[PDB]
Design an enzyme around this catalytic site. Structure first.
Site, PDB file in Angstrom:
ATOM      1  N   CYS A 131       0.793  -1.239   0.000  1.00 35.99           N
ATOM      2  CA  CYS A 131       0.000   0.000   0.000  1.00 35.99           C
ATOM      3  C   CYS A 131       0.826   1.291   0.000  1.00 35.99           C
ATOM      4  O   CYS A 131       1.600   1.546   0.940  1.00 35.99           O
ATOM      5  CB  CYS A 131      -0.969   0.027   1.181  1.00 35.99           C
ATOM      6  SG  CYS A 131      -1.913   1.571   1.283  1.00 35.99           S
ATOM      7  N   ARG A 139      -0.171   4.544   2.872  1.00 33.41           N
ATOM      8  CA  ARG A 139      -0.078   4.336   4.318  1.00 33.41           C
ATOM      9  C   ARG A 139       0.225   5.550   5.216  1.00 33.41           C
ATOM     10  O   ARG A 139       0.128   5.418   6.443  1.00 33.41           O
ATOM     11  CB  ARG A 139       0.915   3.198   4.620  1.00 33.41           C
ATOM     12  CG  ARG A 139       0.402   1.818   4.223  1.00 33.41           C
ATOM     13  CD  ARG A 139       1.430   0.749   4.523  1.00 33.41           C
ATOM     14  NE  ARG A 139       2.445   0.659   3.482  1.00 33.41           N
ATOM     15  CZ  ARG A 139       3.638   0.111   3.665  1.00 33.41           C
ATOM     16  NH1 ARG A 139       3.958  -0.364   4.859  1.00 33.41           N
ATOM     17  NH2 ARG A 139       4.511   0.063   2.667  1.00 33.41           N
ATOM     18  N   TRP A 199      -9.495   6.093  -0.653  1.00 38.57           N
ATOM     19  CA  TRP A 199      -9.878   6.680  -1.934  1.00 38.57           C
ATOM     20  C   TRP A 199      -8.924   6.127  -2.999  1.00 38.57           C
ATOM     21  O   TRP A 199      -7.858   5.606  -2.662  1.00 38.57           O
ATOM     22  CB  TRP A 199      -9.825   8.214  -1.867  1.00 38.57           C
ATOM     23  CG  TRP A 199      -8.514   8.720  -1.343  1.00 38.57           C
ATOM     24  CD1 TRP A 199      -7.332   8.807  -2.027  1.00 38.57           C
ATOM     25  CD2 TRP A 199      -8.257   9.215  -0.023  1.00 38.57           C
ATOM     26  NE1 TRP A 199      -6.350   9.337  -1.207  1.00 38.57           N
ATOM     27  CE2 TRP A 199      -6.891   9.592   0.025  1.00 38.57           C
ATOM     28  CE3 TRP A 199      -9.047   9.378   1.120  1.00 38.57           C
ATOM     29  CZ2 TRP A 199      -6.300  10.099   1.182  1.00 38.57           C
ATOM     30  CZ3 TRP A 199      -8.463   9.890   2.270  1.00 38.57           C
ATOM     31  CH2 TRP A 199      -7.098  10.252   2.291  1.00 38.57           C
ATOM     32  N   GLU A 223      -5.019   3.249 -10.639  1.00 38.06           N
ATOM     33  CA  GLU A 223      -5.719   1.987 -10.423  1.00 38.06           C
ATOM     34  C   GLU A 223      -6.876   1.871 -11.404  1.00 38.06           C
ATOM     35  O   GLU A 223      -7.217   0.777 -11.845  1.00 38.06           O
ATOM     36  CB  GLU A 223      -6.242   1.868  -8.989  1.00 38.06           C
ATOM     37  CG  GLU A 223      -5.177   1.982  -7.905  1.00 38.06           C
ATOM     38  CD  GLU A 223      -5.807   1.936  -6.535  1.00 38.06           C
ATOM     39  OE1 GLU A 223      -6.229   0.833  -6.130  1.00 38.06           O
ATOM     40  OE2 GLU A 223      -5.901   3.002  -5.876  1.00 38.06           O
TER      41      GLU A 223
HETATM   42  C1  HEM Z   1      -6.496   6.336   1.693  1.00 38.63           C
HETATM   43  C2  HEM Z   1      -6.339   6.031   0.396  1.00 38.63           C
HETATM   44  C3  HEM Z   1      -5.599   4.840  -0.082  1.00 38.63           C
HETATM   45  C4  HEM Z   1      -4.907   4.775  -1.249  1.00 38.63           C
HETATM   46  C5  HEM Z   1      -4.775   5.899  -2.247  1.00 38.63           C
HETATM   47  C6  HEM Z   1      -4.346   3.471  -1.345  1.00 38.63           C
HETATM   48  C7  HEM Z   1      -3.569   3.080  -2.437  1.00 38.63           C
HETATM   49  C8  HEM Z   1      -3.321   1.741  -2.658  1.00 38.63           C
HETATM   50  C9  HEM Z   1      -2.892   1.202  -3.895  1.00 38.63           C
HETATM   51  C10 HEM Z   1      -2.634   1.967  -5.168  1.00 38.63           C
HETATM   52  C11 HEM Z   1      -2.750  -0.139  -3.738  1.00 38.63           C
HETATM   53  C12 HEM Z   1      -2.318  -1.122  -4.806  1.00 38.63           C
HETATM   54  C13 HEM Z   1      -3.545  -1.952  -5.193  1.00 38.63           C
HETATM   55  C14 HEM Z   1      -3.503  -2.462  -6.612  1.00 38.63           C
HETATM   56  O1  HEM Z   1      -2.467  -2.360  -7.305  1.00 38.63           O
HETATM   57  O2  HEM Z   1      -4.533  -2.991  -7.097  1.00 38.63           O
HETATM   58  C15 HEM Z   1      -3.091  -0.436  -2.400  1.00 38.63           C
HETATM   59  C16 HEM Z   1      -3.045  -1.710  -1.907  1.00 38.63           C
HETATM   60  C17 HEM Z   1      -3.458  -1.968  -0.618  1.00 38.63           C
HETATM   61  N1  HEM Z   1      -3.940  -1.110   0.297  1.00 38.63           N
HETATM   62 FE1  HEM Z   1      -4.115   0.762   0.161  1.00 38.63          FE
HETATM   63  N2  HEM Z   1      -4.703   2.734  -0.278  1.00 38.63           N
HETATM   64  C18 HEM Z   1      -5.443   3.496   0.557  1.00 38.63           C
HETATM   65  C19 HEM Z   1      -6.043   3.157   1.784  1.00 38.63           C
HETATM   66  C20 HEM Z   1      -5.970   1.905   2.388  1.00 38.63           C
HETATM   67  C21 HEM Z   1      -6.653   1.480   3.547  1.00 38.63           C
HETATM   68  C22 HEM Z   1      -7.630   2.317   4.339  1.00 38.63           C
HETATM   69  C23 HEM Z   1      -6.258   0.166   3.812  1.00 38.63           C
HETATM   70  C24 HEM Z   1      -6.694  -0.736   4.910  1.00 38.63           C
HETATM   71  C25 HEM Z   1      -7.063  -0.359   6.139  1.00 38.63           C
HETATM   72  C26 HEM Z   1      -5.335  -0.195   2.775  1.00 38.63           C
HETATM   73  C27 HEM Z   1      -4.705  -1.412   2.643  1.00 38.63           C
HETATM   74  C28 HEM Z   1      -4.200  -1.837   1.408  1.00 38.63           C
HETATM   75  C29 HEM Z   1      -3.897  -3.260   1.162  1.00 38.63           C
HETATM   76  C30 HEM Z   1      -4.048  -4.420   2.113  1.00 38.63           C
HETATM   77  C31 HEM Z   1      -3.439  -3.337  -0.094  1.00 38.63           C
HETATM   78  C32 HEM Z   1      -3.011  -4.593  -0.815  1.00 38.63           C
HETATM   79  C33 HEM Z   1      -4.292  -5.266  -1.336  1.00 38.63           C
HETATM   80  C34 HEM Z   1      -4.029  -6.607  -1.984  1.00 38.63           C
HETATM   81  O3  HEM Z   1      -2.990  -7.267  -1.737  1.00 38.63           O
HETATM   82  O4  HEM Z   1      -4.882  -7.073  -2.774  1.00 38.63           O
HETATM   83  N3  HEM Z   1      -5.174   0.885   1.953  1.00 38.63           N
HETATM   84  N4  HEM Z   1      -3.422   0.727  -1.723  1.00 38.63           N
HETATM   85  C1  LIG Z   2      -8.353   0.193   0.417  1.00 38.55           C
HETATM   86  C2  LIG Z   2      -7.902   0.430  -0.999  1.00 38.55           C
HETATM   87  C3  LIG Z   2      -7.658   1.728  -1.455  1.00 38.55           C
HETATM   88  C4  LIG Z   2      -7.234   1.922  -2.775  1.00 38.55           C
HETATM   89  N1  LIG Z   2      -6.977   3.144  -3.288  1.00 38.55           N
HETATM   90  N2  LIG Z   2      -7.067   0.880  -3.592  1.00 38.55           N
HETATM   91  C5  LIG Z   2      -7.301  -0.377  -3.175  1.00 38.55           C
HETATM   92  C6  LIG Z   2      -7.075  -1.454  -4.202  1.00 38.55           C
HETATM   93  C7  LIG Z   2      -7.093  -2.834  -3.597  1.00 38.55           C
HETATM   94  C8  LIG Z   2      -6.592  -3.789  -4.662  1.00 38.55           C
HETATM   95  C9  LIG Z   2      -7.131  -5.184  -4.429  1.00 38.55           C
HETATM   96  C10 LIG Z   2      -7.470  -5.818  -5.768  1.00 38.55           C
HETATM   97  O1  LIG Z   2      -6.328  -6.536  -6.209  1.00 38.55           O
HETATM   98  C11 LIG Z   2      -6.652  -7.469  -7.231  1.00 38.55           C
HETATM   99  C12 LIG Z   2      -6.410  -6.783  -8.564  1.00 38.55           C
HETATM  100  N3  LIG Z   2      -4.944  -6.799  -8.717  1.00 38.55           N
HETATM  101  C13 LIG Z   2      -4.471  -8.044  -8.060  1.00 38.55           C
HETATM  102  C14 LIG Z   2      -5.626  -8.583  -7.213  1.00 38.55           C
HETATM  103  C15 LIG Z   2      -5.148  -8.981  -5.814  1.00 38.55           C
HETATM  104  C16 LIG Z   2      -6.176  -9.717  -4.967  1.00 38.55           C
HETATM  105  C17 LIG Z   2      -6.355 -11.094  -5.096  1.00 38.55           C
HETATM  106  C18 LIG Z   2      -7.292 -11.749  -4.296  1.00 38.55           C
HETATM  107  C19 LIG Z   2      -7.496 -13.234  -4.437  1.00 38.55           C
HETATM  108  C20 LIG Z   2      -8.039 -11.024  -3.370  1.00 38.55           C
HETATM  109  C21 LIG Z   2      -7.831  -9.650  -3.261  1.00 38.55           C
HETATM  110  N4  LIG Z   2      -8.543  -8.916  -2.364  1.00 38.55           N
HETATM  111  N5  LIG Z   2      -6.909  -9.035  -4.051  1.00 38.55           N
HETATM  112  C22 LIG Z   2      -7.724  -0.645  -1.869  1.00 38.55           C
HETATM  113 CL   LIG Z   3     -10.151  -1.458  -8.033  1.00 33.21          CL
END
Ligand code: HEM
Ligand SMILES: Cc1cc(N)nc(CCCCCO[C@H]2CNC[C@H]2Cc2cc(C)cc(N)n2)c1
Ligand SMILES: [Cl-]
Ligand code: HEM
Ligand SMILES: Cc1cc(N)nc(CCCCCO[C@H]2CNC[C@H]2Cc2cc(C)cc(N)n2)c1
Ligand SMILES: C[C@H](O)[C@H](O)[C@H]1CNc2nc(N)[nH]c(=O)c2N1
Ligand SMILES: C[C@H](O)[C@H](O)[C@H]1CNc2nc(N)[nH]c(=O)c2N1
Ligand SMILES: [Cl-]
Lengths: 362, 362
Positions: free
Chosen positions: B65, B68, B237, B242
């Protein structure tokens, strides 16, 4: 252990190399000769076939390289016979000329005598054979900041740069036994340069940007079967992004994005306008357009990635494990538009290969 | 060992959490109560302060993320009291409403009762609370192909999509004890959508693109001190890329680059024209412009990376090790223009954290 390190690598290399060359039956006998030579001489000497194929395998194993599809057509020049600095210079001059090939770049490596007791016979100081000098003093930055330390080292040795943003560094290398390296100005007739223009935007030429035609890495060690070729310069042709997205764009390099933004007529005031991204794209279009117009080989990152996919397919079809460094293989521009971005690669080191080594200066 | 796994994680979490909350002296006593409760009940119950801070730490530890910096202002909603599917639905409806906040998005997490014997109390099927349906049959692709399997599962359960490219999937979740999940159509008054227009190119609206305002991940497990909160949807947000560089651009998603190329008036015939890169940039400008114009929160990748640099600085200033996944942290557009590209990150898993878990369907 050192001689044992040598023999182990030799056994692994000769086996693999000869298998690939359909010369499997000759392994046993060749390994014997080598075993003896190591016992007697403290080392062994590659046949020309082994050397050539080793250098090709080494390119094939280069995890950071997107252009590996063409590994098997690498042009190998055997200069293990050089003994003098004039011969080294002439071999370097020749490499530039034959690799450039009037713009139709030939991927070439020239191979100099290998280290002996870890003792270098030829120590090349250049990072690339052709590169621009860099200067920094009293607030004024000139040329390529990545060249600053080598440039200052050259200027210790009596060379003086003109202090344009594009001074060609002299060749600089040290011979075994000499305390100081020598340097030679590059003949400008040998160096192809490309002025950067844009296909649509006439004002782009106002930036007065250019780059050299051929990237010739001269500071890595080629390792083949336990033999350390520290001096073995090699070249391909550029992928455009190396020039447009890094050399000309990086803040710590030529840092041209604001100027690019201005000449393409966009404001450089707001992050949300994505002006840097837009500038990057137009600059990269300009680079590809300019090289093509001058008849100098170059590849765009999309075509390159398509070639790399074929490299991957060939590897599997031939039963070879594929290794790669994802972080270097992705292009710095639109990476997610290539297949590379969407898979993973095993970053294991396989030999033969090219390795970093310590700089002789600073 | 399982109960031992629990107690070990509890000891590590309570210590760390209380240290950060300046409640160090209360660790000994609290750990005793927990030790007893585990012995007696087979588990333990977080105080509201522990739960809130745990969820915040978990965001802080999310290696992938970029956003953060704002971990400590996460809005935590404690719904450990829900027992019925109507309460679960109403809590999900509420999360959407309060997180959206009329466009001024509040990063929120709603936390449902945790697993017991690895037994879920609430099993959410959606990947996000708001997402578009996907269909594929007889050559015709409609909507979001990433949604195809969930969509077909919903349509088993008696739901029927309108088969526009932007059908909102119903909420779908299963209660402990029920064999089948239930589903509820989302009230459209709760769902903010943004039509994609371009600041300069009027024809961009011809593409009739849109996206939803708020990404609310509902399929990950929040783990805090050995307690498994499998149902704990959270949102931030969007970062523009994305949407513009992936959701709308990927070949296996909405695949819009050729159409983008056409409406911005560029040929999509030659790799060397970098039409995909140019299309990507304009599409991404459009996304940012559109969200801003509608008063829906969004961040560009440059600002986001600048915020992440501050997150890095804060971490070191507070004496916390920083962990990160370089491959996810770099933006898919102009990555080398951010500082992230030029350093490395330790990809170690620290708990609390959010984890993938197996889908309940297909
Ligand atoms: C406040 C605005 C936020 C922005 C702009 C942001 C931005 C991002 C971005 C760009 C990614 C990459 C996801 C992708 O490539 O599809 C990401 C992943 C992630 N964010 Fe954030 N995020 C935000 C808030 C949060 C919040 C509130 C949480 C949880 C409490 C969080 C937890 C995560 C997690 C766990 C991932 C990895 C998800 C996965 O592995 O599928 N984020 N974030
Ligand atoms: C909280 C939040 C804020 C923000 N700005 N953006 C996000 C994006 C969360 C991305 C999660 C979606 O990830 C999908 C699409 N790319 C890889 C794939 C990862 C994945 C796989 C699986 C099995 C579950 C899961 N939740 N996520 C989350
Ligand atoms: Cl999305
Ligand atoms: C034929 C055209 C070639 C192209 C288009 C190409 C492309 C590239 C690119 C884009 C990189 C990344 C470098 C960077 O990010 O700065 C790279 C790295 C590399 N290439 Fe190639 N390459 C080519 C030929 C060769 C040849 C002939 C060799 C050696 C025989 C080679 C070996 C390497 C090595 C070792 C690296 C990593 C260099 C380092 O770690 O500093 N490549 N290549
Ligand atoms: C053969 C070839 C073809 C082609 N198209 N492109 C290349 C580029 C070679 C890149 C080598 C330069 O890399 C520098 C700049 N980015 C990281 C840095 C890596 C590096 C460090 C050191 C100490 C030595 C070295 N040779 N390379 C090489
Ligand atoms: C798994 C493979 O590395 C894949 O391309 C990754 C790369 N980096 C990424 N980075 C982000 N932000 N989001 C992603 O979905 C991916 N996918
Ligand atoms: C060391 C750090 O990961 C750095 O940003 C890397 C990333 N990927 C790269 N990829 C390429 N092709 N060239 C580079 O110089 C770098 N630098
Ligand atoms: Cl270069």
């Amino acid at each position: 252990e050192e001689k044992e390190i040598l023999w182990n690598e030799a056994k692994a290399f000769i086996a693999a190399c000869y298998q690939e060359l359909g010369k499997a039956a000759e392994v046993k006998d060749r390994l014997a000769d080598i075993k003896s030579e190591i016992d007697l001489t403290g080392s062994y000497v590659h046949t020309k076939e082994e050397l050539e194929h080793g250098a090709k395998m080494a390119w094939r194993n280069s995890n950071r390289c997107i252009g590996r599809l063409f590994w098997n057509s690498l042009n190998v020049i055997d200069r293990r016979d050089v003994r003098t600095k004039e011969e080294v210079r002439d071999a370097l001059f020749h490499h530039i000329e034959t690799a450039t090939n009037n713009g139709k770049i030939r991927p070439t490596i020239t191979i100099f005598p290998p280290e002996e007791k870890g003792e270098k016979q030829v120590e090349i100081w250049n990072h690339q054979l052709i590169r621009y000098a860099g200067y920094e003093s009293d607030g004024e930055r000139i040329g390529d900041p990545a060249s600053c330390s080598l440039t200052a080292a050259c200027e210790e040795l009596g060379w003086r740069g003109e202090r344009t943003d594009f001074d060609l560094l002299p060749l600089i290398f040290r011979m075994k036994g000499d305390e100081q390296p020598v340097w030679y100005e590059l003949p400008r007739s040998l160096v192809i340069e490309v002025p950067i223009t844009h296909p649509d935007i006439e004002a782009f030429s106002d930036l007065e940007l250019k780059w050299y035609g051929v990237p010739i890495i001269s500071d890595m060690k080629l390792e083949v079967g336990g033999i350390h070729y520290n001096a073995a310069p090699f070249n391909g042709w550029y992928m455009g992004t190396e020039i447009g997205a890094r050399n000309l764009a990086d803040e710590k390099r030529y840092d041209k994005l604001k100027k690019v933004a201005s000449v393409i007529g966009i404001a450089a005031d707001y992050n949300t306008d994505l002006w840097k991204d837009q500038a990057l794209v137009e600059l990269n279009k300009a680079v590809l357009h300019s090289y093509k117009k001058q008849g100098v080989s170059i590849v765009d990152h999309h075509t390159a990635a398509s070639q790399f996919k074929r490299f991957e397919e060939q590897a599997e079809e031939a039963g070879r494990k594929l290794t790669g460094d994802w972080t270097w293989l992705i292009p710095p521009i639109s990476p997610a538009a290539t297949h590379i971005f969407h898979r993973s690669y095993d970053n294991s080191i396989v030999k033969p290969n090219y390795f970093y080594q310590d700089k002789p200066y600073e």
